[PDB]
Design a protein around this ligand. Structure first.
Ligand SMILES: CC(C)CCC[C@@H](C)[C@H]1CC[C@H]2[C@@H]3CC=C4C[C@@H](OC(=O)CCC(=O)O)CC[C@]4(C)[C@H]3CC[C@]12C
Ligand SMILES: CC(C)CCC[C@@H](C)[C@H]1CC[C@H]2[C@@H]3CC=C4C[C@@H](OC(=O)CCC(=O)O)CC[C@]4(C)[C@H]3CC[C@]12C
Ligand SMILES: CCCCCCCCCCCCCC
Ligand SMILES: CCCCCCCCCCCCCC
Ligand SMILES: CCCCCCCCCCCCCC
Ligand SMILES: CCCCCCCCCCCCCC
Lengths: 51, 51
């Protein structure tokens, strides 16, 4: 909430204050941190099949 | 009118903008300008009665 009667001020002020939410930032962080292990697991699986 | 949700801001802002209204200022001005002639008329009336 904001103290004003001007329509649209709340939207822009919220956007400026929070360009991106913390939760989604952390979701992206964990996904990026986790993907390399998945890649390594897939590579090891295929290598084991070939061997 | 003012653009805000704060209660009491309109009262103080109006008071600051207009410490005194123009109409009442002009009423005071004309009364002050006119009183001396009334005083002179009364003085002349009493002097004429005495004479
Ligand atoms: C926690 C770990 C120790 C066990 C749980 C994960 C594994 C079971 C993962 C590691 C790599 C995965 C594989 C990596 C890639 C593929 C993608 C996908 O490949 C396809 O068939 C693509 C579809 C197509 O061929 O058109 C099917 C699942 C599979 C075999 C995955 C099956 C599950 C695997 C073996
Ligand atoms: C525009 C001009 C030319 C004419 C119109 C005004 C006059 C009629 C004025 C000028 C001075 C005035 C006088 C000035 C003072 C007094 C106050 C007052 O005096 C009292 O009797 C006070 C009461 C008391 O004695 O206890 C009565 C009206 C009177 C005589 C006024 C009556 C009307 C007068 C004569
Ligand atoms: C103007 C505001 C700029 C904010 C930019 C935020 C970028 C966040 C990127 C998150 C993904 C990595
Ligand atoms: C979004 C991707 C970021 C870069 C990830 C780098 C992963 C490196 C390990 C890949 C191992 C698989 C080799 C075949
Ligand atoms: C503080 C604001 C001060 C404003 C004073 C205005 C005085 C007006 C006087 C009118 C009577 C002569
Ligand atoms: C509020 C009063 C302001 C001063 C007025 C001055 C008037 C002068 C004339 C008086 C004449 C009567 C003499 C008896």
């Amino acid at each position: 909430r904001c103290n004003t009667q001007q329509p649209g001020c709340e939207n822009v002020c919220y956007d400026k204050s929070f360009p991106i939410s913390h939760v989604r930032f952390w979701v992206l962080q964990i996904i990026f941190v986790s993907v390399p292990t998945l890649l390594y697991l897939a590579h090891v699986f295929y290598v084991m099949r070939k061997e």
